[PDB]
Design a protein around this ligand. Structure first.
Ligand SMILES: [Zn+2]
Ligand SMILES: [Zn+2]
Length: 909
């Protein structure tokens, strides 16, 4: 049984200090043979979820807490320290509110702050550590003011009677032992308990210098600056029980209370299971409302899939069943709410202006998702599996990985705030980390080096994303050279290896939106800027999800927004000619116009397929169906080619080899529908499941369990299932001895297998673009160019590509020009004026209001003299003059520039 437990500890999430990350701290506490650990960061619970995930895995009990800067009228302007532990969940939601109250209140340079009297209402379930020499009671003792001491203790004697402990710390800092003595006395005289703490900020004592620089970078000081605050001692590392016991041997009850307190603290953070909000229904069980909509959804989907042409009545069965099997699993696991929430949201986005990304996770395998128009692929057709997305044989959180554009966030939030409540909705925090370049940069400044000396090392660091220091040393031979040649450079880099990855701040921008069933502060604390605005959950995208809140991420995918513009343009065309608006989901997936094109390798602007190596793969492959469109992203990899698996796929398809299920030597003829569209090769994860379904007789639930069993790659569990495969073979009935011979291959073929529900989701959008480029190239290309206005080169290039595919693209004309590119009545592309760098949407809107205010622009003068000046700057006019927008009307550019002076004289009169 334990002698001591650390109740005051900081991680990098404190941001103003801390060095080690959450999990490592957990692992050190573990190695030290300790029962529990309390990470108490500065005014946040940012790593709380990670903390729990780690304590679970390491067999350590997490203790929730946080340090606070405090102010009470009693000490005036001066701030004091206070550590607050959550004994139970009543106190953990109080601690959350405190943190949220500090930030929501706004702050200045001292950071967020709490009023000690806030501890009056936010009280139950909390255990306070005095703060030590820096606490309100602590300072008074050193100041020697007895009345003050009595008056502070009177607050804790009243509001935290058995929950206030005098914190004793021996880190060899000024006025420590002095306070300790004074505190110990007060303790004995007032009957107050003490407790020992090491005020930990780093793991090993030798991490002290790395921490000092970590702080300095934040404090904006140079390391050797005399006026640089020196607030930490090397003793503030994570000490052992022994070290801590010998250290406080003269006051055991201080050590004993760490163990008592640790016992009194037990907070529950339920991870891995949703807390869904309530979907509008009326009088109907959320379960019931799902089926009414799912069935109505399947009605439409079936009418379309199988037109009145009542062949549907012969294939309708296979669907009605699937819907039920799913709908039952969904309703048993308490997820109908989720499916509805996403359904409705996706609908709202279609009606309003919001485009949502292609990512549906594994959801494309849900026939219910199909019915609710959450996914637009029919999973029956393409053997997309429901129990790969949501398997009742395991615990999981159904995620459609739905994301929208960060630009349209305020619009999205407004809608979910209407649907589920204003303070029920919130944005998600994002953290800044010191990457290789930036850490070299900042450690350089702190060690007193000019930006020139340092940038010479930062420039060696490759720009590749996810680049680490260790990789830079591998790729760039100059680094180890200069590292061993210069003692200063090597001290710089040694230190930057220690700080690499550390967290410096919050965004910047949020990661997305989250929706709680009640006010957000019930599930997470808030973070705010200096003025208590721009609130976000202190948990980030991953953590907030695991805490069991429904989230929607942001993304900068320009592909989906392009397709909107195309259809917009395309449908305006439909408006004049009196024909039905186009539903992009209703397009045929078998279209030779599109596929003949695909094979020509004309994929520029075709989402995903438009790289270089892909176009080589395409030529070599020659896909004629949507099936091998899905296979495309799965074949384009180092794994498949390194094994020749791709060279096989193409060879079979094209007759250079005869199909086999899967192998020439080992195979069976009952895998017909399973390995047919893949031409016999084991490509997708769903196929690994399906062979085990028909060959063995797995229930797809167990098939899914096996798929993962292989990924765990520990024989025990594989041997368990192995036998399950052999007897499974003979029951439904086949030849064994091959079930074992094919198994050890699918064992390996599942290795580089690919999630099909994920591929088809994206592949659909690739095809949707390929199609638009084939049947409406003008509208689509115009849309693509509207998406690239900000980049001139891309525009020029796209113009070439237009002319090459036989499109007529007209240069900037001030009379017909719009902000976005568009298509004229004759099917020609009109240059979007927004493409002219330095003009902007403002002036362009003005130019149009002017033009719609008559006809207009018989010449430059007619524009200048017309359009409101300063809505249209003279410099904005040069940009226009120089784009050749007036080339039709008056004289040409050079001659017009000279005339500009005059036209603006006349302009105002
Ligand atoms: Zn600190
Ligand atoms: Zn602290």
């Amino acid at each position: 049984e334990p002698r001591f437990v650390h109740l005051h500890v900081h991680s990098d999430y404190s941001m103003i200090d801390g060095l080690a990350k959450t999990a490592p701290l957990v692992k050190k506490a573990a190695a030290l043979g300790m029962p529990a650990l309390a990470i108490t960061d500065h005014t946040n619970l940012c790593g709380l979820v990670k903390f729990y995930g780690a304590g679970h895995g390491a067999g350590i009990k997490p203790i929730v807490g946080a340090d606070f800067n405090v102010q009470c009228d009693l000490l005036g302007d001066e701030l004091t320290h206070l550590t607050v532990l959550a004994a139970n969940n009543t106190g953990y939601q109080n601690l959350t509110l405190l943190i949220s109250k500090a930030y929501q209140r706004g702050y200045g340079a001292a950071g967020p702050i709490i009023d000690r009297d806030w501890l009056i209402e936010l009280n139950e379930g909390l255990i306070l550590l005095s703060g030590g020499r820096m606490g309100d009671v602590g300072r008074s003792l050193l100041r020697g003011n007895s009345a003050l001491v009595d008056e502070c203790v009177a607050f804790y004697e009243e509001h935290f009677p058995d929950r206030y402990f005098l914190e004793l710390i021996r880190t060899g800092r000024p006025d420590e032992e002095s306070y300790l003595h004074a505190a110990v006395e007060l303790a004995e005289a007032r009957g107050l308990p003490v407790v020992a703490t090491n005020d930990v900020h780093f793991i090993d004592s030798s991490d002290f210098d790395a921490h000092e620089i970590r702080v300095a970078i934040h404090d904006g000081f140079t390391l050797d600056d005399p006026k640089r605050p020196r607030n930490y001692s090397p003793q503030q590392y994570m000490r052992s029980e022994e070290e801590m016991c010998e250290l406080f041997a003269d006051i055991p009850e201080a050590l004993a209370n760490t163990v008592e307190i640790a016992k009194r603290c037990n907070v529950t953070v339920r991870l891995g299971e949703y807390f869904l909000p309530q979907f509008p229904t009326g009088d109907m069980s959320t379960e019931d409302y799902l089926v009414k909509r799912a069935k109505e959804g399947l009605e439409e989907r079936l009418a379309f899939l199988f037109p009145d042409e009542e062949e549907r009545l012969k294939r309708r069965p296979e669907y009605d069943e699937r819907l039920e099997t799913e709908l039952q699993v969904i309703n048993q696991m308490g997820f109908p709410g989720y499916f509805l929430i996403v359904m409705e949201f996706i609908q709202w986005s279609k009606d309003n202006g919001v485009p949502v990304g292609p990512g549906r996770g594994s959801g494309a395998g849900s026939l219910v998702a199909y019915a609710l128009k959450i996914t637009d692929l029919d999973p029956l057709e393409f053997d997309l599996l429901f129990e790969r997305f949501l398997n009742p044989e395991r615990v999981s959180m159904p995620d459609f990985d739905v994301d929208f554009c960060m630009e349209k966030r305020d619009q999205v939030i407004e809608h979910v705030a209407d649907m589920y409540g204003r303070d029920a909705v919130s944005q998600i925090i994002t953290f800044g980390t010191m990457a290789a370049k930036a850490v070299i940069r900042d450690v350089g400044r702190v060690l007193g080096h000019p930006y020139g000396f340092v940038d010479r090392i930062s420039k060696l660091i490759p720009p590749d994303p996810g680049m680490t220091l260790a990789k830079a040393f591998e790729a760039e031979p100059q680094l180890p050279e200069i590292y061993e040649a210069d003692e200063e450079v090597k001290a710089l880099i040694d230190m930057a290896r220690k700080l690499e990855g550390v967290t410096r701040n919050a965004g910047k921008h949020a990661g997305g939106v989250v929706i709680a069933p009640t006010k957000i502060t019930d599930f997470a604390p808030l973070y705010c800027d200096e003025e208590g605005k721009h609130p976000v959950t202190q948990f980030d995208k991953s953590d907030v999800e695991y805490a069991g809140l429904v989230k929607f991420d942001f993304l900068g995918l320009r592909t989906l927004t392009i397709i909107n513009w195309a259809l917009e343009m395309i449908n305006k065309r439909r408006a004049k000619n009196g024909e039905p608006p186009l539903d992009i989901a209703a397009i045929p997936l078998d279209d030779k116009k599109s596929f003949d094109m695909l094979q020509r390798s004309e994929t520029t602007a075709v989402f995903q397929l438009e790289s270089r190596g892909m176009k080589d793969l395409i030529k070599r492959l020659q896909p004629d169906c949507f099936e091998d469109m899905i296979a495309l992203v799965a074949l384009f990899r180092p794994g498949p080619l390194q094994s020749g698996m791709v060279d096989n796929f193409i060879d079979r398809k094209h007759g250079r080899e005869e199909i086999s299920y899967p192998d020439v030597q080992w195979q069976h003829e009952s895998l017909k529908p399973v390995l047919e569209p893949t031409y016999g090769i084991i490509l997708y994860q769903e196929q690994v499941m399906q062979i085990a379904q028909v060959l063995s007789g797995y229930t797809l639930g167990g098939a899914d369990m096996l798929r993962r069993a292989m990924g765990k790659k520990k024989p025990e569990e594989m041997a368990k299932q192995r036998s399950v495969f052999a007897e499974g073979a003979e029951k439904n009935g086949i030849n064994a001895e091959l079930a074992m011979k094919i198994f050890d291959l699918v064992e390996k073929f599942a290795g580089y297998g690919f999630n099909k529900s994920h591929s088809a989701a994206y592949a659909l959008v690739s095809y949707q673009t390929l199609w638009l480029k084939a049947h409406y190239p003008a509208e689509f290309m115009a849309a693509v160019m509207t998406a690239d206005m900000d980049n001139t080169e891309k525009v020029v290039g796209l113009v070439d590509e237009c002319w090459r595919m036989g499109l007529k693209i007209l240069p900037p004309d001030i009379n017909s020009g719009l902000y976005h590119f568009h298509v004229n009545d004759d099917g020609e592309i009109v240059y979007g004026i927004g493409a002219i760098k330095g003009v902007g949407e403002g002036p362009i809107e003005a130019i149009i209001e002017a033009r719609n205010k008559g006809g207009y622009f018989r010449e430059l003068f007619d524009l200048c003299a017309r359009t409101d000046t300063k809505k249209l700057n003279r410099r904005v006019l040069e940009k226009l003059i120089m784009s050749g927008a007036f080339d039709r009307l008056g004289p040409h550019r050079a001659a017009l520039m000279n005339s500009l002076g005059d036209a603006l004289k006349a302009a105002d009169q």
